[PDB]
Design a binder for this molecule. Structure first.
Ligand SMILES: OC[C@H]1O[C@@H](O)[C@H](O)[C@@H](O)[C@@H]1O
Ligand SMILES: OC[C@H]1O[C@@H](O)[C@H](O)[C@@H](O)[C@@H]1O
Lengths: 409, 416
């Protein structure tokens, strides 16, 4: 048998090396050192989670293993500080996370027809709002079951969960909280960041549950649907970065906010890439290159990404500081409110309920971009990255406008 | 026609974006921001270097353009501080340079037969020594033509040039200078780092000259070769496993050169040198199936053919301070340095010819790759003669051959 397309004997060589670097405490805190550890660790736990009987269900087993396992390694101090640093240097300083998402978006968007583009976006945004309504309705419902005043349910539970994640919700929602109340950002942030991560774990769990239910009741699922020389693949990489650059320059210095909403650079990228598709500036050869590149990331490096995601974007200590029976239940139900909210809305709009609940439901309640990858990898619908981003970025910018209003009153 | 396989209209989109990021001064100082700029800049100047007859000869011209051009952009302050930072963050903090070399080495070594491995290394090291001798003989010869005492020619000119580059020569040769003399490291380093970079530019130039001469006089050249069962399939997995092996092998080598076997004897073995022995061992062990062994090759191709232009943009930024060069571009140093390089060329040419290697390739691997700025240099040189597949050999000289210069140094320095 083979591991991660590596035969056992060979994997041993690497697994041995990992441990030599580990116990000798010798590791370069850079790309090389990072991918080295991440590839090996991800490989084993990927396979393990790929074949755990109960633990591996559908396709959403493999990644969730690496993801959760990696977090347990940080919390239990299993990683050394240099190892955490190496991985962190790849995910943040070097910023592999964005690149990864950037590659995906480009590859996913450049593969579809131009005619089909504008058809979706018009019916999608309403679905997102439908999800929020359900997220609020259920939250308040269960909230009063816990004897918790409505305002808090919206300010400390609903809004932050549906928020566009750490940078997009906790970073700015604490800012709006301080601007309107005057109370410390920390007071809010700490509670928000903690609870949103709880829900993020539920989102990833229900993503696999809807997968099972989707393949059990085909009528609800769309089965992954809502509605060449290297040079070609290399050009895909160029377009992935260059498109992200443009979007960045737009959200920072040109068109940071269209109106009362602040448009996150990833949201612009979607409109930039989509525009680039419709412009047909990219030949079908190149448009494939972007697809093929996207595959390489989503199929080879997905395990690696999870090792990084389970390290940086999952502080298990802060979760524990808020894992009172109350928060665990309240948070979960809010997520289910989002599921049913986006399911109903999408069904009415013409989308498949299962995919609608993931893209316009779970992808809202998750920890934004890091979250989307965590969720989408759990339902094996990684090809919906583009949609997931709309909710986390644009749909996140929506939560802010709503937040100011609710916070104000 | 197409700028880096991109039609002119599309390239415009990117080239426009680059300039928007530039003038608005908005750029993420990370991988994404880096590759974005590097890909675009490299693309145009890559094409341009090749297009001009005088500017480019054969396939040699493309990289040297990006390389030199990129340095001129830093010196002339054409790049913004954030842009230099972005590129620097990719090359150093993120350490793309090593990865790149790591991928190459792995792909090059895992492609050859196991029987053929040990045949070369035994005849190579002597050739390196032959190159040094010629590098010293010529240096002293021209040195006395400039009325410069021999000791200095060896301490401030020869040794540092042949040194294993910045980290390997200037960083440690100034250390040996201070241990034996007692005089400041700066005094040495500043002069050494300056002059070695001068020679590094000559090395890259003669690499293309030997290319022309090699294809003009085929008898001297091996056409990419120093020395005179079947893949069934390729999977990304297979290519992906190549990437794993590239990193995991570098890790092991690193753990060996730091905590296990830093120095075999009087020589300190740089981690890259170990990697060569680790990968070579891994080949002979056959732990990797031919499918995987190809994956490493294919991965190597992707870097050496797609990302080579990108690398140069980074190499021309970080590892080429044009201001310190100017601080030592006296007619004297320019000439003395150049001739030392030519001494290395002829030294490694003669030696290799006697050992059984092709003179042209021998002069590049055991000659110019010694006098260059180590690893950054090898890539600069090997891309100039289009013999990128000799990375493995170039590394032996820059790392192991560099560890040799140190032992020699302590003796010469001690002698005073
Ligand atoms: O739903 C239409 C299309 O949208 C794209 O963004 C996704 O990448 C495809 O999987 C999907 O077919
Ligand atoms: O010279 C023998 C072989 O050495 C390897 O390291 C190179 O990658 C090959 O190009 C060459 O054929």
């Amino acid at each position: 048998f083979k591991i991660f397309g590596m035969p056992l004997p060979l994997y041993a060589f690497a697994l041995i090396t990992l441990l030599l670097s580990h116990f000798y405490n010798a590791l370069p805190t850079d790309i090389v050192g990072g991918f080295a550890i991440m590839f090996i660790i991800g490989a084993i736990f990927g396979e393990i989670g790929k074949r755990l009987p109960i633990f591996n269900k559908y396709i959403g087993g493999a990644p969730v293993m690496i993801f959760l396992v990696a977090a347990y390694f940080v919390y239990a101090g299993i990683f050394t500080q240099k190892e955490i640093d190496a991985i962190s240097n790849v995910m943040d300083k070097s910023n592999f996370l964005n690149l990864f998402i950037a590659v995906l978006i480009t590859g996913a968007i450049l593969s579809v027809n131009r005619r089909l583009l504008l058809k979706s976006l018009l019916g999608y945004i309403p679905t997102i709002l439908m999800g929020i309504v359900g997220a609020s309705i259920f939250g308040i419902a269960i909230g009063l079951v816990f004897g918790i005043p409505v305002d808090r349910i919206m300010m400390l539970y609903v809004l932050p969960i549906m928020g566009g994640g750490n940078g997009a919700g906790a970073v700015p929602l604490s800012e709006i909280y301080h601007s309107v109340t005057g109370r410390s950002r920390e007071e809010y942030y700490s509670t928000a960041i903690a609870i949103l991560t709880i829900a993020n774990i539920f989102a990833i769990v229900f993503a696999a549950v809807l997968d099972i239910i989707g393949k059990k009741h085909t009528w609800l699922s769309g089965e992954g649907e809502l509605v060449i020389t290297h040079r070609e693949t290399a050009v895909g990489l160029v377009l992935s970065t260059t498109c992200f650059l443009l979007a960045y320059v737009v959200a920072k210095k040109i068109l940071p906010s269209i109106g009362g909403v602040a448009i996150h650079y990833f949201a612009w990228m979607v409109l930039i890439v989509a525009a680039l598709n419709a412009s047909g500036l990219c030949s079908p050869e190149i448009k494939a290159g972007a697809k093929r590149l996207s595959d390489f990331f989503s199929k080879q490096l997905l395990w690696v990404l999870m090792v990084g995601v389970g390290v940086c974007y999952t502080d298990l200590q802060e979760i524990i500081n808020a894992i009172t029976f109350a928060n665990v239940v309240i948070a979960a139900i809010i997520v289910i409110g989002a599921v049913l909210g986006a399911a109903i809305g999408g069904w009415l709009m013409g989308f498949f309920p299962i995919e609608s609940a993931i893209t316009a439901g779970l992808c809202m309640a998750n920890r934004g971009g890091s979250g989307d990858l965590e969720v989408l990898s759990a339902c094996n619908r990684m090809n919906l990255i583009s949609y997931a981003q709309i909710s986390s970025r644009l749909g996140g910018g929506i939560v802010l406008v709503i937040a100011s209003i609710v916070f104000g009153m």
